[PDB]
Design a protein around this nucleic acid. Structure first.
Lengths: 36, 53, 153, 269, 69, 83, 476, 127, 68, 37, 84
RNA sequence: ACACGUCGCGCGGU
RNA sequence: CCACGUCAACAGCAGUUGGACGUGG
RNA sequence: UGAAAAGAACUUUGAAAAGAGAGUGAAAAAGUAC
RNA sequence: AGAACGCAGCGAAAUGCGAUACGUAAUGUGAAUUGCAGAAUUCCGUGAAUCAUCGAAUCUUUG
């Protein structure tokens, strides 16, 4: 199991996805963004 | 044993006896209860879980 | 419909329970119901639990018919202890339901006093008892419905 | 140049001329004991009933083959067993069965009708219509004065039309009285409805003509008007339920037609 | 044509109908018992009683034909 | 033309199904008038048999149980699965 | 025994997630909300890009292989939701071996299901490592540690979100599934994309369909459809995109007959005579789960062949190392060794337009057929449907107050159940291979899986919900 | 309801004749509710035997002013369910609600081909 | 299976199962041909078209070719 | 006693003991059910 | 253990009546309850055979008994009452 | 067709 | 009867049991 | 019983029955030989 | 005349009909029928009747 007991926030789950969608635009092209 | 009126009757029937003589194990009493069938009680007899006095 | 019948409570200071059509004596349970009393639920419970062991039954006021001659108690203004554990099982079943209804309540805790309890004739089961020359006498097998209501004091 | 002579009142009406005499027959002392006796005599002849059944006894064979024990025969009965019977049932005594004569038919009631008594009964009834004040007491209301009991035209026959009945009814005023008969008190009779009893409407006015009836197809129907002829009429029409002093309406021609008779029976007091 | 009562049935000659009737009866005897099934079906009730209803027709025609001679 | 259908239904039950396995035996419930010969003929023309024993007795269903053994070459597995 | 155990020791379990739940309430209303979130992530992979020097699903994960891993790929996102199905392939193997002895740390002896849940989290991370080390990311066998780290994070994270949401449904607080659901979702998207893909296009029609892609079917319309009867063929001017369409048409007719075909045998002998309910058994949908895992096996096979031959052991001789690792190459297409067992279990690289191999076709049909039926027989044991579970279920109901007569009523259940399961998986594995040949979208096997899951599951879902009639239940 | 007079059942037997005699096509009389004034003018009639798809509004109850298609109407009970209200208990334990046709007025007709012809071609008394 | 060793020999066992299967199983019966198609189809379409729809927005950000 | 033989008379009575009412319930819900049995 | 001889000279000659043995088994159960300081006293079929052998009349007077304990305490008390 | 020696069969015994 | 599932009623108390109740054979 | 079965959903308690609270309706001391 | 025993998808209660087994038909009507659960048939012209036919084709066993 997990030592943390909260796993229905309903979040944490959204937080992991939300950071992921933001980061990949800065990193990489998708609409003529700068590519790192 | 519980409900084993039928199994005293059936086990006695397969070993052809008056029902006093036939013996049923205390430990494997649950497994004796999971018989119900005439070929099932034959396996139990071969095991030695049901014997005859 | 039914209960109380001595209506003063009121339900934000009450709990309630009833047994219904149970096959335990009208005659003996009225005496238990009148006796319970009063007394919080734990006192009623641990008179009746000790009654199973030893501590009689519960004092009989009016249904005090002979019998031999008697005896050792208690006998606190009665003198005719009998032991029907049959009616004790009935009232314990009434009390456990009453105390569970009075645990969701959320009220509590010193409070109490069994405020009315009344036994309703569920009816009598009617069977027969053998005797002489084709003539057969009545045999009642005694039973009852019952109602219990408790209030804060 | 008078005597019982009357002023004619048409339904046109709003009147103009004069009528024929008011009958000599319309006199006699108003006698309520004869009026009540005749009313019960006529109503009895139709009357009879139904009740319980099975047999009007008697499934249920016997003599009195009662069988002792205690408390005695009872007084009675016999046949038989686990039921039904004791007594029972064959009674009376009945926790189950009949009564001590099931309504009986059998039980010849009747009054037969003598020739003399019937013509006295009609003559006294006709004289009982000739009053006034007793109309209010019976329980029907008349505003208009005088011309009484009411007298109307021959034109009454020919209708037919619904609206001309209303035009007839304004004149006699009256009117309001038939409006009472279309009003709750009219309500809803219970179990007494089948054989009539009832709950709880009143009656209204009776219209009589002569040559006719008339009783034409339209004249039957209305809130509690009744329609009749001088040749054939009765005390049920003249005072229903025998509490004298009905509100009565007549037509002309009625005097002369009533006047001539033979037979024989005439006025004295 | 597309089935199966009543105008198709009642005026048909008759050897064809008897042959069909015994094989519609074979559907219901294949679907008996049980194989009833779960059902009812309304088809099982209907074809059971179509056998009845048109055995009236065949026996009726023989009866009425025998009263024409 | 005064005859009847013999078979009212096949009986399927524990013992009935076991008979199919044991020795190619179907068992039917046949009319209360049902004679032995007609059962032999009917089973022939509904299952292409020959029958190697018919015997019949009562049941409290009223309809007469008919215990019908069938030839080896028949196969009672497919054709008891065709009912 | 057929497989070994793996560490599942008590401190080790605590390190890896398996969800220690907070307070929840078991109510129907809650369950659908979570299912919706899981479904939503599948779409998001197509929307959102990923960082890399080639990455967009143009990283050569091979044409047959890519579809039945599934990640909703073929636009954006490479590997994503791919790791979970490999993890689910483990769950079967381990359960069906049914270890009693020996076999490394207990709770993995047919309780191998609970071992798998912990291990699923590792493999999300771990599948990414497999991609770079085989050189499926264009490695010269270590392009740089830091660059390989930057791709790895992108790959694992998308399928990780789904995997967390999967645990929240399989802890008896869903009705949905994470694992089963995504596999089906990708294939529906693929069918319409392939049909309107640009495969030699001069001009659009004036539309770019419902995406932003133009096609062969656009070109026909601009010149009027009247030009192919003024031409010396009726094909190979629209045939590449028409192949994708007719692929679906072959599949469409045969699935619906099979959904209708069920071994019903109602056993619900009544009180009050006749029978009052129904009982049916799904003939082919018990074997649904076998076929998915079989397709997943072949997808994994391609990678392990290349890695084994050149860069794990050997080379000394290609055939020596293994027959599947025989002649490991990128060949004329895919990879796809051109020889060995791996060669056969793949299309001939023409999608059935060459079947005069002769050998290739023969091996493919028989091998797949046997593998699917193998997973059907291991499905019976303790991972799926057997008569013994159903016997207890029927006692609660009482079989609508059972006919009851002993001992065949109990016996009737056990005898039929092995025979049906074997038939179910045996049929599908034969059919799937034939689907590739007639017409494909990149896997005709995948089209067959898509229709079986999608049509059936909609019917199931509403009944579970508390509702009837196959109406809404989206967030209700 | 029925018109006077011939048979002189006073009588609860007169009520029993209504209750227990007369299946569907003399329930046609007791499944009739008045027409409007517009659709009265249109066909010249007065009232119509109800269709299961004629739309009808309630006039004389405690539920006295709702429209709806008739969900069912029962021959033995001479009574109409209207779609719907109903009245839920929370888990989908659901209720009928029943009505009497001479307490209703029919708003929109579905009225059919030779159905409207037979009705307008003399009544009675050809059965 | 492979009693004498021929292809007919393992066929026999699967026939014992198969012979049952062909007699008792049926197609979606007319109402249910339309019913299954009706219940999905919009459902088949929507899944396929949601992934198609995202792409309408996404490519014309870099250069307008149809806008999005 | 002596009847018109026979096994057959016993058989019709034997069916009648099954055919027997016994029992149920669900129609008593929808009737008009004036207590019987 | 402890070994006690239970004085069945007291009352067990005095009863009978007809029905010594079930009263006697109950007497052993509460005598052993007092001596051991326990709740349930086991009563094995060894002791049941021991009392019912000579048969109600029909008891080999005083009986030696080997008894063990207890500290369990309540939950699943061990009072063996036969031989330990 | 009884019964022990046998995990089960077979083999041994009257 | 046999077999399986039950305790509202019946069993002279009670019930984990039945010759009762329920369904089949 | 009631115009209509709306013949009592849901929650807690109870071995089960039922009980408590709540729902339906004009009215439940109209809750089922009402 | 009457009566036994069957028949059903269910079969408590009634009466509907006979192994073809509440059947259906020929005149006839109009949106609902199979009492109910279930399984179904119909619905702008061939589903469903005793609203009426001292009217009818089938017709076990006993009398």
């Amino acid at each position: 199991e997990d030592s943390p007991g909260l796993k229905v926030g309903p979040v944490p789950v959204l937080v992991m996805s939300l950071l992921f969608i933001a980061s990949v635009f800065m990193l990489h092209i998708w609409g003529k963004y700068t590519r790192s | 044993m519980a409900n084993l009126r039928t199994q005293k009757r059936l086990a006695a029937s397969v070993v052809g006896v008056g029902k006093r003589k036939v013996w049923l194990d205390p430990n494997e009493t649950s497994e004796i209860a999971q018989a119900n069938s005439r070929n099932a009680i034959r396996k139990l007899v071969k095991n030695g879980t049901i014997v005859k006095k | 419909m039914a209960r109380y019948g001595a209506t003063s409570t009121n339900p934000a200071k009450s709990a309630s329970a009833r047994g219904s059509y149970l096959r335990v004596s009208f005659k003996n349970t009225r005496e238990t119901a009148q006796a319970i009393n009063g007394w919080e639920l734990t006192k009623a419970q641990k008179y009746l639990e000790q009654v199973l062991d030893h501590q009689r039954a519960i004092p009989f006021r009016r249904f005090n018919s002979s019998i031999g001659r008697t005896a050792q108690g208690k006998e606190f203004g009665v003198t005719k202890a009998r032991w029907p554990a049959k009616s004790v099982k009935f009232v314990q079943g009434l009390l456990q339901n009453a105390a569970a209804n009075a645990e969701a309540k959320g009220l509590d805790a010193t409070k109490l006093y069994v405020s009315h309890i009344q036994v309703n004739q569920a009816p009598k089961q009617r069977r027969r008892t053998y005797r002489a020359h084709g003539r057969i006498n009545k045999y009642e097998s005694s039973p009852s419905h019952i109602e219990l209501v408790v209030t804060e004091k | 140049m008078s005597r019982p002579q009357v002023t004619v009142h048409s339904l046109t009406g709003e009147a103009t001329a004069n009528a024929l005499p008011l009958p000599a027959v319309f006199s006699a002392p108003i006698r309520p004991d004869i009026v009540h006796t005749v009313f019960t005599s006529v109503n009895k002849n139709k009357r009879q009933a139904y009740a319980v059944s099975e047999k009007a006894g008697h499934q249920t064979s016997a003599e009195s083959w009662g069988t002792g024990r205690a408390v005695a025969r009872i007084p009675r009965v016999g046949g038989g067993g686990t039921g039904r019977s004791g007594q029972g049932a064959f009674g009376n005594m009945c926790r189950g069965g009949r009564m001590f004569a099931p309504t009986k038919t059998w039980r010849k009631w009747n009054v037969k009708v003598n020739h003399n008594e019937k013509r006295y009964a009609t003559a006294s009834a006709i004289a009982a219509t000739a009053v006034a004040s007793l109309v209010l007491a019976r329980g029907h209301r008349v505003e208009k004065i005088p011309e009484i009991p009411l007298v109307v035209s021959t034109d009454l026959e020919s209708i037919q039309k619904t609206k001309e009945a209303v035009a007839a009814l304004k004149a006699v005023g009256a009117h309001s009285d038939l409006l009472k008969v279309l009003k709750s008190k009219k309500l809803r009779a219970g179990k007494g409805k089948y054989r009539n009893r009832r709950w709880t409407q009143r009656r209204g006015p009776l219209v009589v003509y002569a040559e006719d009836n008339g009783i034409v197809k339209a004249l039957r129907n209305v809130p509690g008007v009744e329609t009749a002829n001088v040749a054939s009429l009765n005390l049920l029409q003249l005072a229903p339920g025998a509490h004298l002093g009905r509100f009565v309406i007549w037509t002309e021609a009625a005097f002369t037609k009533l006047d001539q008779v033979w037979g024989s029976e005439t006025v004295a007091s | 044509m597309a089935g199966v009562k009543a105008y198709e049935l009642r005026t048909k000659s008759k050897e064809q109908l008897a042959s069909q009737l015994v094989d519609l009866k074979k559907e219901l005897a294949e679907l008996k018992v049980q194989k009833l099934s779960r059902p009812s079906l309304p088809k099982i009730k209907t074809v059971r009683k179509s056998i009845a209803c048109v055995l009236t027709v065949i026996n009726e025609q023989q009866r009425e034909a025998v009263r024409q001679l | 033309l005064d005859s009847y259908k013999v078979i009212e239904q096949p009986i399927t039950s524990e013992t009935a199904m076991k008979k199919v396995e044991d020795g190619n035996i179907l068992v039917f419930q046949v009319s209360m008038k049902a004679n032995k010969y007609q059962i032999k003929k009917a089973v022939k023309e509904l299952y292409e048999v020959d029958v190697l024993k018919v015997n019949t007795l009562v049941r409290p269903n009223g309809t007469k149980k008919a215990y019908v053994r069938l030839t080896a070459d028949y196969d009672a597995l497919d054709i008891a699965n065709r009912i | 025994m057929a497989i070994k155990f793996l560490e599942v020791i008590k401190p080790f379990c605590v390190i890896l997630p398996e969800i220690q739940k907070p307070e929840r309430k078991i109510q129907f209303k809650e369950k659908v909300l979570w299912t919706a979130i899981t479904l939503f992530i599948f779409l998001v992979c197509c929307q959102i890009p990923l960082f890399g020097i080639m990455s967009s699903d143009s990283a050569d994960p091979f044409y047959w292989m890519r579809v039945i891993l599934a990640s909703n790929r073929g636009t954006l996102m490479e590997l994503g939701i791919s790791p979970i199905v490999t993890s689910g392939l483990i769950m079967q193997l381990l359960a069906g071996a049914k270890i009693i002895e020996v076999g490394d740390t207990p709770k993995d002896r047919a309780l191998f299901n609970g071992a798998q849940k912990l291990f699923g989290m590792i493999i999300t991370i771990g599948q990414s490592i497999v991609y770079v080390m085989t050189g499926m990311y264009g490695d010269p066998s270590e392009m740089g540690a830091g660059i390989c780290l930057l791709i790895t994070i992108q790959l694992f994270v998308a399928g990780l979100i789904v995997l967390l949401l999967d645990e929240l449904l399989q802890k008896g607080y869903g009705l949905g599934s994470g694992i089963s659901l995504f596999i089906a979702t990708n294939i529906c998207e693929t069918i319409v994309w392939k049909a309107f893909s640009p495969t030699t296009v001069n001009t659009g029609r004036g539309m770019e369909f419902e995406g932003a892609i133009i096609a062969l079917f656009h070109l026909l319309a601009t010149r009027t459809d009247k030009v192919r009867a003024l031409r010396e063929a009726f094909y190979r001017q629209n045939l590449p995109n028409l192949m994708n369409l007719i692929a679906t048409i072959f599949v469409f007719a045969v699935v619906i007959y099979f959904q209708g075909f069920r071994v019903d045998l109602p056993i619900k002998s009544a009180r009050y005579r006749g029978q009052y309910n129904t009982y049916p058994i799904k003939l082919f949908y018990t074997s649904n789960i076998p076929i998915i895992l079989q397709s997943a096996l072949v997808s994994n096979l391609y990678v392990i062949s290349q890695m084994l031959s050149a860069r794990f052991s050997g080379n000394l001789l290609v055939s020596l190392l293994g027959t599947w690792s025989d002649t490991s190459s990128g060949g004329p297409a895919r990879a796809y060794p051109v020889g060995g067992l791996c060669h056969y279990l793949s299309p001939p690289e023409s999608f059935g337009s060459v079947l005069e191999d002769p050998v290739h076709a023969v091996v493919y049909i028989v091998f797949m057929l046997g593998s699917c039926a193998f997973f059907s027989k291991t499905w019976i044991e303790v991972s799926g449907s057997s008569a013994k579970d159903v016997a207890k279920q029927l006692k609660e109901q009482q079989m609508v107050m059972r006919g009851h007569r002993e001992t065949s009523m109990v016996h009737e259940l056990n005898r039929y159940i092995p025979t049906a399961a074997a038939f179910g998986g045996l049929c599908i594995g034969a059919l799937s291979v034939l689907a590739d040949f007639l017409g494909a979208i990149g896997s005709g096997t995948g089209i067959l899986l898509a229709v079986t899951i999608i049509y059936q599951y909609f019917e199931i879902f509403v009944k579970e919900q508390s509702e009837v009639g196959s109406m809404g239940a989206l967030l209700f | 309801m029925a018109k006077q007079s011939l048979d002189v059942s006073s009588d609860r037997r007169k009520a029993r004749k209504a209750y227990f005699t007369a299946p569907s096509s003399q329930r046609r009389v007791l499944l009739s509710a008045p027409l409007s004034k517009e659709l009265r003018a249109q066909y010249g009639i007065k009232a119509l035997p109800i269709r299961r798809d004629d739309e009808v509004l309630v006039v004389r109850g405690s539920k006295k002013g709702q429209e709806g298609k008739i969900s069912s109407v029962y021959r033995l009970k001479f009574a109409v369910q209207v779609d719907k209200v109903t009245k839920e208990k929370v888990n989908g334990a659901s209720v009928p609600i029943n009505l009497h046709p001479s307490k209703l007025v029919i708003t929109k007709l579905h009225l059919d081909k030779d159905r409207k012809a037979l009705i307008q071609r003399k009544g009675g008394k050809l059965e | 299976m492979d009693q004498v060793m021929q292809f007919v020999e393992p066929s026999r066992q699967f026939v014992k199962d198969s012979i049952r299967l062909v007699k008792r199983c049926t197609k979606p019966d007319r109402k249910e041909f339309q019913k299954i198609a009706m219940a999905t189809a919009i459902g088949f379409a929507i899944m396929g078209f949601i992934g198609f729809f995202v792409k309408l927005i996404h490519i014309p950000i870099n250069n307008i070719i149809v806008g999005g | 006693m002596a009847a018109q033989k026979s096994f057959r008379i016993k058989q019709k009575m034997a069916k009648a003991k099954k055919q027997n009412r016994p029992l149920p319930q669900w129609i008593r819900l929808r009737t008009n059910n004036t207590i019987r049995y | 253990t402890r070994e006690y001889t239970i004085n069945l000279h007291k009352r067990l000659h005095g009863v009978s009546f007809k029905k010594r043995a079930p009263r006697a088994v109950k007497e052993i159960k509460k005598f052993a309850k007092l001596h051991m300081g326990t709740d349930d006293v086991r009563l094995a079929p060894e002791l049941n055979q021991a009392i019912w052998k000579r048969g109600v009349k029909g008891v080999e007077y005083r009986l030696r008994l080997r008894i063990s304990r207890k500290r369990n305490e309540e939950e699943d008390a061990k009072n063996p009452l036969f031989s330990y």
